[PDB]
Amino acid sequence: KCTLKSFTVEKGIYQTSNFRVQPTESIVRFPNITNLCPFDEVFNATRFAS
Amino acid sequence: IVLTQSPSSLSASVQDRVTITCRASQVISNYLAWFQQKPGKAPKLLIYAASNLQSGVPSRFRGSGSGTDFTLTISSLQPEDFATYYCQQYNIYPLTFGGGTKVDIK
Amino acid sequence: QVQLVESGGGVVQPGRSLRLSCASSGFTFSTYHMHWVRQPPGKGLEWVAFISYDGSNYYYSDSVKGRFTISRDNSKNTVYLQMNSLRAEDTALYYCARDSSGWHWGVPFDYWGQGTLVTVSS
């Protein structure tokens, strides 16, 4: 009735609006390979620099 | 090198908040540890560096302080958590431990 | 899993030395430091000597000086303390402690040990 802007509607098929499925959740993904920096060999080591 | 714990005996009923204090002759710069030797077993470390809980098995035993004054304020004490509390510096190597505070039952 | 079980607990006459073997399990013995804390009966925890990660650093408590040799064989996995002369006062239950405290990673006296009921008798 609002789409035709009238309180009276004649018989027929009318495109009132659109239907959209809404996203359930959010997934973030990045590469598995660690590519670990060697902070391990600087932060802890048997000896340190003077 | 000298640590003294003031409250030698405290008796607290369940839910009482008990505060225990040990102070050092020289500044220890946030390097103090508090332990809870239950009678008949070896001690377990309850706080390290004065402000950090350790393995996390203790959950309500908040403690705080820097330099000379460090105090361990137990919150909602349960009857099981009754056992002598001892304190020691952990970084100056001639390490020492205080006399101890016993949270006994009333 | 993590444990620091101890052995060598027995009565010893004064002036007689018994090696105390503090075995280790479930730990990388080399990185962790080990030190000895003794509780005399009806008293409080006291401290004795320390061995570093390399086994190259030894520091001793003032109360007993040069009276004990603390040695860490990583392959054996056992820190050994032997006291050349045992005073009647030292009738304590010796306790073994694991301290990771200089590596940007650890905190002091983390596990502790069941303990050995050393005894001095006459």
From Swiss-Prot, chain A:
Residues 20-36 are annotated as: Disordered. Changing R47K: In strain: Mu/B.1.621. Changing N32Q: Reduced viral infectivity. Glycans are attached at T24, S26, N32, N44. Attaches the virion to the cell membrane by interacting with host receptor, initiating the infection. The major receptor is host ACE2. When S2/S2' has been cleaved, binding to the receptor triggers direct fusion at the cell membrane. When S2/S2' has not been cleaved, binding to the receptor results in internalization of the virus by endocytosis using host TFRC and GRM2 and leading to fusion of the virion membrane with the host endosomal membrane. Alternatively, may use NRP1/NRP2 and integrin as entry receptors. Binds to host ACE2. RBD also interacts with the N-linked glycan on 'Asn-90' of ACE2. Cleavage of S generates a polybasic C-terminal sequence on S1 that binds to host Neuropilin-1 (NRP1) and Neuropilin-2 (NRP2) receptors. Interacts with host integrin alpha-5/beta-1 (ITGA5:ITGB1) and with ACE2 in complex with integrin alpha-5/beta-1 (ITGA5:ITGB1). May interact via cytoplasmic c-terminus with M protein. May interact (via N-terminus) with host bilirubin and biliverdin, thereby preventing antibody binding to the SARS-CoV-2 spike NTD via an allosteric mechanism. This is Spike protein S1. The chain holds residues 300 to 349 of 1273 of the full protein.
